[PDB]
Design a protein around this ligand. Sequence first.
Ligand SMILES: O=C(O)c1ccccc1NS(=O)(=O)c1ccc(I)cc1
Length: 189
Amino acid sequence: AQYEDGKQYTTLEKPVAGAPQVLEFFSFFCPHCYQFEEVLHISDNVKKKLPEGVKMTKYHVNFMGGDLGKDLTQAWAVAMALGVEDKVTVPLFEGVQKTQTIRSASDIRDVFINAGIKGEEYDAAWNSFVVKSLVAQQEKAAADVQLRGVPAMFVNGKYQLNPQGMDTSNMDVFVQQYADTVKYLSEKK
Ligand SMILES: O=C(O)c1ccccc1NS(=O)(=O)c1ccc(I)cc1
């Protein structure tokens, strides 16, 4: 497709050194993310359009979710370390926006246990330094890229994607165009 700076994507003047290939931010407390995750399946589409060698990274923000928003950021880090992020993505989104049963950190812990993660193992990771540093990096990245919206994707910490500069007439096009822009930027610099 056609890609021009200022419309589909925008190059940041302040690049993030040592940033991953595909960085995406989201929050289970944000319905805007649920729409991009389940309705549009942006992440899923991108993961398949990305060439071999490019890994994706999904971070949780702390400015969306009130107080418990921070707790879920820590929980998400554990999911990433265990490798059950995708598996818990759906139940976490549902339990926060649909059922809204997840009110405390104890509720989040239960989700992991139900998925198949032992409480002891989870709790051990919950109190692990590895996870703590992951939480810090999650917010640090967002603060470095000057995150304005919750659901946003950054390629190599240099190119920022703009959804307001794409097709807003056909959902199919938007989803494909977005992922196409990501891939172009990934195979760019
Ligand atoms: O939801 C938004 O804020 C948004 C902003 C820009 C582009 C799309 C957005 N949402 S959406 O992708 O789910 C969407 C796309 C096309 C149409 I018509 C309505 C919503």
